[PDB]
């Protein structure tokens, strides 16, 4: 999520 934080890293796409």
């Amino acid at each position, epitope marked *: *999520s*934080d*890293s*796409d």
Partner: antibody
Amino acid sequence: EVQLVETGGGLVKPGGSLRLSCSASRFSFRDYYMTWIRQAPGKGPEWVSHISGSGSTIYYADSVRGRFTISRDNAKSSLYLQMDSLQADDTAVYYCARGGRATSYYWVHWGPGTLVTVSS
Amino acid sequence: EIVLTQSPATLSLSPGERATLSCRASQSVSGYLGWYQQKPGQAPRLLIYGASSRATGIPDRFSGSGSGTDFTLTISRLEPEDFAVYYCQQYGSSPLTFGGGTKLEIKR
């Protein structure tokens, strides 16, 4: 596809100054940590500095603290590295790299790099 | 800081062989370790994050293993395009650090 392009590298005398810019496009620049990485000739890469998407959280490697200043203009989708009191051992290719939204631990998206040479 | 020791410094293999690249950390970094490939005049290219999780688009012959202090990058059978410099990178603890690199060259 994420696009990053560093500019501003060049030759500078020790003690001189240089301002690097990284232009970002095709993503939501303000939502991501941005990072500066540098690589000396023949060496591996070295982390330089982090800046949060808001610009309010900033970290520096000890070797550049007090000499380098990271900033960003989210309106212009632009990352900057202001380099003062440059030293011979700052000679390196400088890269900007996109982090995560809340962390910047490793890097998928890198610019092509800009060469900074510090020499008398 | 955490020091990343990469061995061997240079690795000489023929296309088609299997390459095993080792990265040793001075302290445990858990599984927070990545691998990059670098070709002349280009930025590093992420191959592996989280010690073993492949990055997007990376061919399946690239695999990473290990945890804690001893990590390995394996190329199942080397393609002509795979001869390059390879770096490990830890992010278990700040400051984030890279290894010194392994250069994979063509044996003839």
